[PDB]
Design a binder for these strands. Structure first.
Ligand SMILES: [K+]
Ligand SMILES: [Mg+2]
Length: 228
RNA sequence: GGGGUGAAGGAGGCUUCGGCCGCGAAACUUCACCCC
């Protein structure tokens, strides 16, 4: 059998022919999350873009109102007073160009890296081959480079997410935990969607949000009307 | 229905209760792009 009984029971709960409203979906997610941990709620969308064109890629960040209920270890590389600013914002580890070494040597305990523009020359050359493969290399497009380092760190710690379409034109993002109250999930889902529409490429043709779905880490999906 | 590839989620998944699979890119699940 392709699925286990846990999952098969979940199938009973969803109507593949129904296009749910965000709120309907938000209430149903608690029931589609039966794995043995607090699953993450996800949103997926097929976009009306040509992923082959640089000017039609959809990429950006969005601060979810109620976060992801998750822990995120932030590493910040800064210069001068921004070192203080980064520590006072809560960065788990704050350093100067001298920390690139620790990582170069072994240190790999962090989930995100941010940097000020004035250390990017070093970060780029000395770390692109480590962080880059992992998609952790600081970059303006990922909102992880800036002189407003404290602000970036605060946003990330508070649950800001990144989104970038894949090469097939589909895009995906975590938007909360299945333990979230429905109302809060609805708020997060809507924020992600507005963020998405805010990134529709100027040249994209046809319907932007061709299809949108909500699901959980281990359960089935529910199609939704993004504008509900 | 059987599968591949991508991205995302993910620390657990399945079970005939013996164990099998995963915590490596890799289980499992989701949307896509494809093969049959
Ligand atoms: K999933
Ligand atoms: Mg993968």
């Amino acid at each position: 059998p392709k699925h286990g009984k846990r999952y098969r029971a979940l199938l009973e709960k969803v109507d593949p022919n129904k296009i749910y409203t965000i709120d309907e979906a938000a209430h149903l997610v608690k029931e589609l999350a039966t794995a043995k941990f607090d699953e993450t709620v996800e949103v997926h969308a097929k976009l009306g873009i040509d992923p082959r064109r640089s000017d039609q890629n959809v990429r950006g960040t969005v601060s979810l109102p109620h976060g992801l209920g998750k822990q995120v270890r932030v590493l910040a590389i800064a210069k001068g007073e921004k070192i203080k600013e980064a520590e006072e914002a809560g960065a788990d580890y704050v350093g100067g160009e001298e920390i690139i070494q620790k990582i170069l040597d072994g240190w790999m305990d962090f989930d995100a890296v941010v940097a000020t523009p004035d250390v990017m020359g070093a970060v780029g050359s000395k770390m692109g081959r480590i962080l880059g493969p992992r998609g952790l290399l600081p970059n303006p497009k990922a909102g992880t480079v800036g002189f407003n380092i404290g602000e970036i760190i605060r946003e990330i710690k508070a649950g800001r997410i990144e989104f970038r379409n894949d090469k097939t034109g589909a895009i995906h993002a975590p938007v909360g935990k299945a333990s979230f109250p429905p109302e809060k999930l609805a708020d997060n889902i809507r924020a992600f969607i507005r963020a998405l529409e805010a990134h529709k490429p100027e040249g994209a043709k046809g319907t932007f949000l061709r299809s949108v779905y909500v699901t959980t880490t281990m359960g089935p999906s529910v199609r939704i009307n993004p504008h509900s």
